[PDB]
Amino acid sequence: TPASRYITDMTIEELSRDWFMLMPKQKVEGPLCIRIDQAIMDKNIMLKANFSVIFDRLETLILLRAFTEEGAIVGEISPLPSFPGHTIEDVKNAIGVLIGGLEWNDNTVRVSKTLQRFAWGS
């Protein structure tokens, strides 16, 4: 799990931020996590994780959270596990569905970053 093939985005502070749900909104198709709060909608979510790579491709994921400059949160996003864990090609859908939630109200959605580069592809 070298740093050349394992990257620690989230520091020791991005791990345990909690916030509270006015009216959340959830959806999922496969191994990704999705959320928008509908009263607290369109806040900055900073989804960082300690991921890994191999051959410029998939090794793993941990979790993702929400952060702004002010520090608020609209919801939560992460690479979800499943029966096989996190299917790469299903991340095409799980991250796939994870891209278009809030987009109806002209405010773009947040997506998970781990399964993007190596699961959401292939």
Partner: protein
Amino acid sequence: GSHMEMAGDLSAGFFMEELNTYRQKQGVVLKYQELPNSGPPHDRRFTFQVIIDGREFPEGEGRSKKEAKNAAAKLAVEILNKEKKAVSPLLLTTTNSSEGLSMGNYIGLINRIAQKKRLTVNYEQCASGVHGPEGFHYKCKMGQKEYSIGTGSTKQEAKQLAAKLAYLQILSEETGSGC
């Protein structure tokens, strides 16, 4: 006008079956539109109208043979390429133009909104603990005539009210000219 001029399958459609490619994303299941050999000044060019977006006249044509209908979808390559330029004004005129959950803090953008005259915005207290809440009358400012002021019992329950009243001063203050 003409992309190909000689093509043609011999067991398939061609201008519908071999014509399947670009209309995957351009998205047109043509209940087909036919403008073949429409030239008024003596031109029989097959504009067997393939479509770019759902009604349009993709068209480029040269003769009533393999020449013509191919460059029908000539511009049905393009109007997706063309027109990628903007459509909206400064924002979408949509009834849902950007959300974003505007700031809940007060003294944050107060100094911004102190742009009324670029004010001295300042806050201080002497928080008694004698009896513990013994008395906290607050004295600060935004604006320059309504000295932002608060009053309360316990500290954090009353820490802002002047500074709240500060941040909520200038937008009501007629000041900025001196009186």
